[PDB]
Design an enzyme around this catalytic site. Structure first.
Site, PDB file in Angstrom:
ATOM      1  CG  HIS A   1      -0.277   0.059   2.548  1.00 24.80           C
ATOM      2  ND1 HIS A   1      -0.074  -1.054   3.340  1.00 24.80           N
ATOM      3  CD2 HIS A   1       0.235   1.106   3.242  1.00 24.80           C
ATOM      4  CE1 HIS A   1       0.535  -0.692   4.456  1.00 24.80           C
ATOM      5  NE2 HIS A   1       0.736   0.611   4.419  1.00 24.80           N
ATOM      6  CB  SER A   2       0.242   4.634  -1.353  1.00 22.04           C
ATOM      7  OG  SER A   2      -0.932   4.034  -1.879  1.00 22.04           O
ATOM      8  CG  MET A   3       2.580   4.463   4.866  1.00 20.83           C
ATOM      9  SD  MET A   3       2.087   3.126   5.968  1.00 20.83           S
ATOM     10  CE  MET A   3       1.764   4.041   7.471  1.00 20.83           C
TER      11      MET A   3
END
Lengths: 242, 82
Positions: free
Chosen positions: A85-87
């Site tokens: 996931h984007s982070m």
């Protein structure tokens, strides 16, 4: 001090997912992979918080070949895929990209996840303001001046023409008519037009390509309606909902 | 002020497990946690993650209110807006 869950059979297909969630992507990939393949590996990261034994950190791939094939190490898996996931897992990305480049240079399937919305001093006749924000690397507030030089190999910048030309440095002046391997573009939450401009200026579409961008841009922040709609059309892009 | 080794540091949710990698591994290192410190109070940060806040809260300027320390279930936000 990390938990990991894996289940491989006959080395079918090892897929690594760094903390996923319930979304439409799963509802689309599940039936597809179930009909196309079987006995696939379901390797997913588990939420830590208490030490146990060791830590994966991408080195789990080597761990498998080192533990199971302790008798002799021939060669690990070639098509490595990293999902999540984007982070901002620049540490994890560093480990992955590093292990890939030192493991097998002629990679066939590479995925660029968590691509930063900033470039790295590149001159293009895209827009008169393109080269302005390009080397400005701010986006409204980016104090990662000491990390941008590292992000090139620990985040994967949207400027692929600069990445490969910085690592391999075998890129010519023309990058058109280049289509053969597989590469996925997942990131560029603000600058979405960058992958559309530089990605289409070469007019080259590989045998397998996918563009999945998010929406951190002020317009998506203010008008979340647009952000939600973009995701809807993105998920329903490969297959339209009944 | 209170930078001593915190005996209470464990991510509630799996999403928070990445926070220790982004901040603690660089800005922290001391061994602190959610027990009040130079970060829990808020700051301008030193990484690109600040963009996600500044652009999502529409110019915070002073305090980053309603952008991080407003929802205990971060995973519930990620499953909505990436």
């Amino acid at each position: 001090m990390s938990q990991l869950f894996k289940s491989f059979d006959a080395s079918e297909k090892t897929q690594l997912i760094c903390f996923p969630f319930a979304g439409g992507y799963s509802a689309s990939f599940r039936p597809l992979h179930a009909f196309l393949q079987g006995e696939c590996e379901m390797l997913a990261a588990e939420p830590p918080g208490h030490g146990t034994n060791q830590t994966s950190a991408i080195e789990d791939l080597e761990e498998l070949t080192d533990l199971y094939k302790q008798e002799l190490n021939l060669r690990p898996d070639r098509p490595f895929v990293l999902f999540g996931h984007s982070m901002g897992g620049m540490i994890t990305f560093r480990l992955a990209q590093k292990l890939e480049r030192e493991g097998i240079f002629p990679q066939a399937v590479i995925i660029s996840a968590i691509q930063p919305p900033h470039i790295q001093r590149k001159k293009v006749s895209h827009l008169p303001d393109d080269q302005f924000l390009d080397h400005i690397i701010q986006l409204g507030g980016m104090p990662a001046e000491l990390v941008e030089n590292k992000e090139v190999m620990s985040f994967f910048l949207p400027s692929f023409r600069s990445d490969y030309r910085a690592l391999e440095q075998f890129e010519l002046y023309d990058l058109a008519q280049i289509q053969s391997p597989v590469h996925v573009f997942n990131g560029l939450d603000d600058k979405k037009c960058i992958r559309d401009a530089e990605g289409w200026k070469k007019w080259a579409k590989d045998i397998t390509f996918h563009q999945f961008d998010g929406g951190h841009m002020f317009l998506l922040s203010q008008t979340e309606e647009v952000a939600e709609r973009i995701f809807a059309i993105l998920n329903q892009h490969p297959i339209i909902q009944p | 002020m209170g930078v001593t080794e915190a005996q209470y540091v464990a991510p509630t949710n799996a999403v928070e497990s990445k926070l220790a990698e982004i901040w603690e591994r660089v800005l922290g290192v001391s061994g602190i946690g959610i027990l009040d410190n130079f970060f829990q109070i808020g700051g301008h940060s030193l990484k690109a993650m600040a963009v996600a806040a500044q652009v999502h809260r529409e110019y915070q300027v002073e305090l980053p209110l309603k952008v991080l320390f407003a929802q205990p279930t971060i995973k519930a936000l990620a499953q909505y807006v990436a």
